[PDB]
């Protein structure tokens, strides 16, 4: 079972966030329109990491975590009323975010 993040009840989300619509996303740093991760601190939309077999993206979301420390990201296209795929860069694991509806509503997203 995925464990609840240590950040789920303490996450600081930045002021004056930009709204995120329900589709049309692109990585800000490359052409990818799939495997995109919404950082829950700042609403950045950046591609997933590259793996040893060539799978995955161009590491833009994990690069962004390394620059900012902003720990949680949600995989766009996985959000339903019951949850989403949430990764914690700080905790090195997929995690549950019981505050995900609040965190997504910060960006105008209705789970
Ligand atoms: O990429 C981002 O910026 C944000 N996400 C992540 O860092 C992330 C990290 C780990 C996981 S994992 O442990 O489930 N696993 C997902 C399959 C991976 C795999 C790759 C090649 C062949 C077989 C398996 C191994 C890691 C899922 C993730 F989404
Ligand atoms: Zn990218």
Swiss-Prot record:
It is found in: Cytoplasm; Cytoplasm, Stress granule; Nucleus. Changing residue 60 to A: Decreased rate of activity. Ubiquitinated by SMURF1; leading to proteasomal degradation. Changing residue 27 to A: Decreased rate of activity and decreased zinc binding. Deubiquitinating enzyme that participates in a wide range of cellular processes by specifically cleaving isopeptide bonds between ubiquitin and substrate proteins or ubiquitin itself. Affects thereby important cellular signaling pathways such as NF-kappa-B, Wnt/beta-catenin, and cytokine production by regulating ubiquitin-dependent protein degradation. Participates in the activation of the Wnt signaling pathway by promoting FOXM1 deubiquitination and stabilization that induces the recruitment of beta-catenin to Wnt target gene promoter. Belongs to the peptidase C19 family. The UBP-type zinc finger domain crystallizes as a dimer linked by a disulfide bond between the Cys-23 residues of both molecules, but there is no evidence that the full-length USP5 exists as a dimer. This is Ubiquitin carboxyl-terminal hydrolase 5. It comes from Homo sapiens. The chain holds residues 173 to 283 of 858 of the full protein.
